[PDB]
Design a protein around this motif. Structure first.
Motif, PDB file in Angstrom:
ATOM      1  N   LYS A  69      -4.013  23.164  21.435  1.00 48.65           N
ATOM      2  CA  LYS A  69      -3.985  23.705  22.784  1.00 48.65           C
ATOM      3  C   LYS A  69      -3.075  24.923  22.795  1.00 48.65           C
ATOM      4  CE  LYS A  69      -2.967  22.355  27.605  1.00 48.65           C
ATOM      5  NZ  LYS A  69      -2.219  21.428  28.510  1.00 48.65           N
ATOM      6  N   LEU A  70      -3.582  26.009  23.368  1.00 48.63           N
ATOM      7  CA  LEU A  70      -2.676  27.149  23.561  1.00 48.63           C
ATOM      8  C   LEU A  70      -1.623  26.827  24.621  1.00 48.63           C
ATOM      9  CD1 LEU A  70      -2.589  30.202  22.502  1.00 48.63           C
ATOM     10  CD2 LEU A  70      -3.749  30.758  24.666  1.00 48.63           C
ATOM     11  N   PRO A  71      -0.334  27.031  24.349  1.00 45.39           N
ATOM     12  CA  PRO A  71       0.706  26.662  25.328  1.00 45.39           C
ATOM     13  C   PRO A  71       1.007  27.665  26.440  1.00 45.39           C
ATOM     14  CG  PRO A  71       1.698  27.538  23.318  1.00 45.39           C
ATOM     15  CD  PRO A  71       0.211  27.515  23.070  1.00 45.39           C
ATOM     16  N   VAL A  72       0.295  28.788  26.457  1.00 41.88           N
ATOM     17  CA  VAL A  72       0.390  29.806  27.483  1.00 41.88           C
ATOM     18  C   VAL A  72      -1.031  30.125  27.919  1.00 41.88           C
ATOM     19  CG1 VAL A  72       2.532  30.758  26.561  1.00 41.88           C
ATOM     20  CG2 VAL A  72       0.350  31.778  25.875  1.00 41.88           C
ATOM     21  N   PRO A  73      -1.212  30.730  29.089  1.00 41.17           N
ATOM     22  CA  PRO A  73      -2.571  31.136  29.495  1.00 41.17           C
ATOM     23  C   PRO A  73      -3.116  32.280  28.638  1.00 41.17           C
ATOM     24  CG  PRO A  73      -1.128  30.882  31.381  1.00 41.17           C
ATOM     25  CD  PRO A  73      -0.213  30.996  30.162  1.00 41.17           C
ATOM     26  N   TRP A  74      -4.417  32.165  28.301  1.00 43.07           N
ATOM     27  CA  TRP A  74      -5.088  33.209  27.544  1.00 43.07           C
ATOM     28  C   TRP A  74      -4.923  34.598  28.169  1.00 43.07           C
ATOM     29  CZ3 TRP A  74      -6.546  33.075  22.820  1.00 43.07           C
ATOM     30  CH2 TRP A  74      -6.897  31.853  22.234  1.00 43.07           C
ATOM     31  N   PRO A  75      -5.047  34.774  29.480  1.00 41.54           N
ATOM     32  CA  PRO A  75      -4.876  36.145  29.987  1.00 41.54           C
ATOM     33  C   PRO A  75      -3.548  36.792  29.609  1.00 41.54           C
ATOM     34  CG  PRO A  75      -5.793  34.746  31.681  1.00 41.54           C
ATOM     35  CD  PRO A  75      -5.441  33.829  30.549  1.00 41.54           C
ATOM     36  N   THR A  76      -2.479  36.015  29.398  1.00 34.37           N
ATOM     37  CA  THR A  76      -1.178  36.596  29.084  1.00 34.37           C
ATOM     38  C   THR A  76      -1.141  37.123  27.651  1.00 34.37           C
ATOM     39  OG1 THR A  76      -0.113  34.619  28.237  1.00 34.37           O
ATOM     40  CG2 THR A  76      -0.059  34.932  30.636  1.00 34.37           C
ATOM     41  N   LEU A  77      -2.164  36.822  26.846  1.00 38.66           N
ATOM     42  CA  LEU A  77      -2.236  37.349  25.485  1.00 38.66           C
ATOM     43  C   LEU A  77      -3.228  38.486  25.266  1.00 38.66           C
ATOM     44  CD1 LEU A  77      -2.177  34.010  23.399  1.00 38.66           C
ATOM     45  CD2 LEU A  77      -0.263  35.482  24.151  1.00 38.66           C
ATOM     46  N   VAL A  78      -3.998  38.838  26.295  1.00 39.37           N
ATOM     47  CA  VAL A  78      -5.049  39.860  26.155  1.00 39.37           C
ATOM     48  C   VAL A  78      -4.451  41.149  25.636  1.00 39.37           C
ATOM     49  CG1 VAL A  78      -6.568  41.394  27.475  1.00 39.37           C
ATOM     50  CG2 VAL A  78      -6.660  38.898  27.833  1.00 39.37           C
ATOM     51  N   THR A  79      -3.330  41.597  26.229  1.00 35.55           N
ATOM     52  CA  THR A  79      -2.837  42.911  25.801  1.00 35.55           C
ATOM     53  C   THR A  79      -2.295  42.884  24.379  1.00 35.55           C
ATOM     54  OG1 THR A  79      -0.682  42.522  26.810  1.00 35.55           O
ATOM     55  CG2 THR A  79      -2.346  43.645  28.159  1.00 35.55           C
ATOM     56  N   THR A  80      -1.773  41.742  23.957  1.00 38.17           N
ATOM     57  CA  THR A  80      -1.215  41.638  22.608  1.00 38.17           C
ATOM     58  C   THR A  80      -2.320  41.572  21.561  1.00 38.17           C
ATOM     59  OG1 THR A  80       0.830  40.580  23.389  1.00 38.17           O
ATOM     60  CG2 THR A  80       0.250  40.224  21.110  1.00 38.17           C
ATOM     61  N   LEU A  81      -3.351  40.768  21.864  1.00 42.40           N
ATOM     62  CA  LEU A  81      -4.492  40.569  20.981  1.00 42.40           C
ATOM     63  C   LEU A  81      -5.343  41.823  20.877  1.00 42.40           C
ATOM     64  CD1 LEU A  81      -5.364  37.016  22.217  1.00 42.40           C
ATOM     65  CD2 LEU A  81      -4.490  37.512  19.924  1.00 42.40           C
TER      66      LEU A  81
END
Ligand SMILES: [Cu+2]
Ligand SMILES: [Mg+2]
Length: 224
Positions: free
Chosen positions: A49-61
């Motif tokens: 399970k990702l422990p943070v919301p996916w939208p919070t990683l969009v800019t990093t990814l």
């Protein structure tokens, strides 16, 4: 540089993260077509399970896939650093909550464009909007303001992301970014301009792992 991006290029993204001690990895795969500013990628949390919301990683990814108009070609730092690549560093400050610090290396490995990232998140509130998973599964339109950093033969960027909260409000994520070339070759240092992005987030109905399908279009603008 630019010539490497005239066609469809395979992309690989690998992220190692630790947010308040919660460790996770993400792997992404897909392609970019910089002629159209188009990115299509699927990301999987390979640790569960990702422990943070996916939208919070969009800019990093992978801003080398931005569409730079021909009249702005002399301002495209990101492709000018290829194939040796660049380091991209950010501080992402979530208002009234914690912060991510990221370091990524973006370069070609053979004909594949690779984004390798380390993410460290600290000072998050245990049932704030991030660790409490209170953010909508979507991602809004915005502008990335780029300026030259002659001192470091690179660029800086600043911008604000507003994440929608399930209750109707917004969670601000202030982004500060620095990019510097890995290689020795000359790079293009741009005049001030911005990148405009459109993003669509979806799910693979056949995928049981925690994941994100991401479609982005990114266009440079601000000089006419
Ligand atoms: Cu993006
Ligand atoms: Mg809403």
């Amino acid at each position: 540089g630019e010539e490497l991006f005239t066609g469809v290029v395979p992309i690989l993204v690998e992220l190692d993260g630790d947010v308040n001690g919660h460790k996770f990895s993400v792997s992404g795969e897909g392609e970019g077509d910089a002629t159209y500013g188009k990115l299509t990628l699927k990301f999987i949390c390979t640790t569960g399970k990702l422990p943070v919301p996916w939208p919070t990683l969009v800019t990093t990814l992978v801003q080398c896939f931005s569409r730079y108009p021909d009249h702005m070609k002399q301002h495209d730092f990101f492709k000018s650093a290829m194939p040796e690549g660049y380091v991209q560093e950010r501080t992402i400050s979530f208002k009234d909550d914690g912060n991510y610090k990221t370091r990524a290396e973006v370069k070609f490995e053979g004909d594949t464009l690779v984004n390798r990232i380390e993410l460290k998140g600290i000072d998050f509130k245990e049932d704030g909007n991030i660790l409490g998973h209170k953010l909508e599964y979507n991602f809004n339109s915005g502008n990335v303001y780029i300026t030259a950093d002659k001192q470091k033969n690179g660029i800086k960027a600043n911008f604000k992301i507003r994440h929608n909260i399930e209750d109707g409000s917004v969670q601000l994520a202030d982004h500060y970014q620095q990019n510097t070339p890995i290689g020795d070759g000359p790079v293009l240092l741009p005049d001030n301009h911005y990148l405009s992005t459109q993003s669509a987030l979806s799910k693979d109905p056949n995928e049981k792992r925690d994941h994100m399908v991401l479609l982005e279009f990114v266009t440079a603008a601000g000089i006419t």
